[PDB]
Ligand binder design. Structure first.
Ligand SMILES: [Cl-]
Ligand SMILES: [Cl-]
Ligand SMILES: [Cl-]
Ligand SMILES: [Cl-]
Ligand SMILES: [K+]
Ligand SMILES: [K+]
Ligand SMILES: [K+]
Ligand SMILES: [K+]
Lengths: 292, 292, 292, 292
């Protein structure tokens, strides 16, 4: 729902760069079988950047259909113009998605006041639960804990994807928000740490190819079995890192193809095909995880 | 014109956030009279982020119409999806613009190879001159001199707006490109330095309100009269800094409103109104520049 | 010993800038009464930088005497020349100190191999237990986990003071070292987090003025009572931050004087007296902690 | 001489790590013949870090003796304790050195006010010219232009070695100081740029092995012949970079040994011998410079 291992799912494409429905179906069955808690549809790893809003919606709706109620679906709804964020969100109103993942505006570098006004207006135009998303390395913008606390007072703003990799944020935010506000890691390599500090789960790239291990790792973590969870983490750590050897989702799409989870590893420009060195790097990491 | 003082022009809005033609006319007249070399239309300072492509196109066409041939117009054409950059570029084919200013894809953090393919594909599908645009603080990625060198070999790719503020970039780029490739500062505070090291001009925010001083400073710099230019630069430096006291273009729109150049300082969310503290800072900088 | 709240104790000085024995005695009695686990003598907060090695040794020996076996004493032994680090360490051989805190060489920015050779030679010239100390913001040098793992294989290298504030180091180092290798925070503001991740204690500036709260906080943490510990942490957090409002130990020495723990707040150049604004800032933080 | 090419000279050692007089003589003769403007003795590249003050003094006196009046000598006199900087400075009173190069206190991270008091006290207690030295990557602190301006009003404080590599500093400083205050690069890779913006010379590592080319480059720069200088700079750029492939002065000592300028490339710990990979990198850079 908004806890445990949530997959930031690739948008599998055919060689023309359009969504491949057979491959998407395969992935969703895989996550259902693997115990993945929920799917984020057309977020960062889903190539929101290169899909238009029509194409984006189509993929979300298709993911919802294919999930067929077996697994919750969260739509990516980020936009750097507030009007566009509202319009995108409105597409999914009364759709069946259980919530939205909405990133700080990118490029235009708003103030903390701008962020507040952005997310508040968005939340006001929907009944859907909103998960905030902070990823300064991609946006040029850093949603600080104090502002998270402001926004957590809005009824349908109910969690955050914290992708800074700065573990001090977990308790800075937690102390400012209510106990049911959800704290999700957006950084695979630090996600178990994030959970040990009081985080509730992760929105994961790694889970695309190691869904069963990730679900188990998060379950152990939630049970306070951190040492057991670390064993899994150590097995996956090469993948947490090397899935970013080239820009995400170049590595993870290749990985999915190699594992036979998708038909092709095709991306849209300006993402380009994985290099030979990248292939070998990712293959090694998959081997280390025992997936190959 | 791709040398000298080039204004990164505001998109003046009425209170509803729609383009104010009368204000835009006033600004264009001001720049024609003040010796500005060219206008960048719907660039960063022009709120490209919050105008849709159709609104974007309208503002460029209006700017051309109002310019009435008296000052060259460069269109902002950046997009983080290569297909979308190409598509936007096509709207301006035979429009009368003299070239395009195209930013590195934002948010998705492409590799240098991806940047190369991005910009190459765009240049391929137009006859218009292309000015590359590097601004890592906004985008999350950094177009490096090596790649600029590769791209400069494309007939159509004629220069760069270098907005890092990292002055070593000037001669790293210059040595990799031909003598006609144009090097333009995208950082007002370091732009005179940038010119002194070999740069050809500036795509300027400060020029929105200090057009004549900017024009003279850039001509003096082009003539090698750096001490003379620097005296002007010193009176402008508070403005170069404090126009970013709050996110651009909030301070510069307020300044234009205060001088009577535009009718309102309205922006679109996630930009919010200037704070009182911001007004005082900006006002003092206007006064140091001799503008109030 | 090497667990719980370890104070990075100020070197209290008279108005001439020499160690004040009465004030030192008062502090040591205070830490004995407060339940502080151990004292680091002439570390960072002890002004190792401005004491010569004779003066440094004198303070260590005086601290040892005054402690009179009631509380363990760790000597600061850092030097950026390996020969000097050995010579300093040798002063304390068979002294009564229970171990040494030895920082990465500062200024000369050694390789990971240089760090390895530095700490290994030092450890080879003593039977004293060695605590490594990483504080890149002061040294220009970052001792990475992998190198920590190398050095942990040396018999008398038994722990690390990790002052990066980067919480990911806790588990990166822990997985590479044996279960009795000690992990101590060197960053008050993140120290409870550091302990929640598996750290064993903190070498603390805050403990100079809030020794009882710090000892209790670390005890709760060690017992797994993290929520109770956080309550104390929140009470101290203003102090964790504001004790660095001006360069350490300017704030904490003023604080000690204000609390009547020391006779004067005198420092050696280039440390200078606390500013009026700094006073008011620290006073507020002490009030928030309920110490004033 | 405080303009032109100033060499940051190595302290050549025998295998025991003691100063090699015969090697030092050879280096000084080389610099006299090659047109170097002056020698910095026991600066950063001279292993000030690992020589004690008495060894430090000996090397300066030997350098003066060997120079025999044929080239000016500046002594490195930095210390992180103000009393110790003054004390070291006194050793060189009436020695024959032409001035001192004094770094911002390292490790203890003083305030700007502390820097001001530090440098003011030092200048006060000598008649020797003082050159301030800013290198935040080594020290943990940053002497800002405002404070440089304050200090430049001291009769005795005559210039700065600016080693940030941040080229905006040149004119920020220049506008705050008199026209006779000397601005010297401390970053070989950006030194020609630094000179082109108004700098007067460079305190150079590269000059240890490319003395004549460095001398000519700096004279051309001083005459405003930047294109001519830049051609030399381009052949030297691999060296400007790869002399820092491993910590300075490891690469430059190896290079001096390879050219036969010094008898051994021995250093003192925590500096360690060059790696094989480092040798190959440095050798290629020597060959690109035409030196092998
Ligand atoms: Cl996502
Ligand atoms: Cl622009
Ligand atoms: Cl300490
Ligand atoms: Cl030097
Ligand atoms: K809420
Ligand atoms: K071209
Ligand atoms: K050990
Ligand atoms: K002076």
């Amino acid at each position: 729902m908004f806890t445990g291992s949530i997959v930031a799912i690739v948008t599998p494409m055919d060689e023309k760069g359009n969504v491949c429905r057979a491959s998407l179906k395969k992935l969703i069955d895989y996550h259902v079988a693997s115990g993945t808690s929920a799917i984020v549809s057309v977020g960062t790893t889903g190539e929101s950047a290169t899909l238009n809003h029509d194409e984006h919606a189509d993929v979300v709706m298709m993911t919802l259909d294919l999930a067929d109620g077996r697994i919750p679906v969260i739509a990516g709804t980020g936009a750097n113009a507030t009007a566009e964020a509202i319009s995108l969100t409105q597409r999914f109103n009364d759709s069946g998605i259980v919530g939205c993942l909405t990133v700080t505006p990118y490029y235009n570098r708003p103030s903390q006041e701008g962020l507040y006004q952005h997310f508040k207006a968005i939340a006001e135009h929907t009944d859907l639960p909103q998960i905030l998303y902070n990823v300064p390395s991609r946006t040029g913008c850093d949603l600080l804990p104090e502002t998270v606390g402001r926004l957590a007072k809005v009824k349908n703003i109910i969690g955050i994807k914290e992708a800074t990799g700065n573990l001090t944020r977990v308790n800075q935010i937690k102390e400012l928000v209510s106990d049911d506000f959800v704290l999700l890691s957006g950084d695979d390599a630090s996600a178990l740490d994030f959970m040990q500090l009081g985080g509730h789960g992760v929105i994961s790239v790694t889970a695309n190819v190691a869904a069963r291990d990730m679900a188990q790792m998060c379950k152990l973590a939630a049970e306070g079995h951190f040492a057991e969870a670390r064993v899994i983490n150590q097995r996956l750590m090469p993948l947490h890192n090397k899935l970013f050897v080239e820009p995400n989702p170049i590595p993870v799409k290749w990985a999915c193809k190699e594992l036979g989870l998708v038909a092709t590893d095709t991306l849209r420009l300006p993402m380009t095909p994985i290099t030979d060195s990248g292939r070998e790097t990712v293959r090694a990491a998959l081997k280390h995880a025992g997936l190959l």
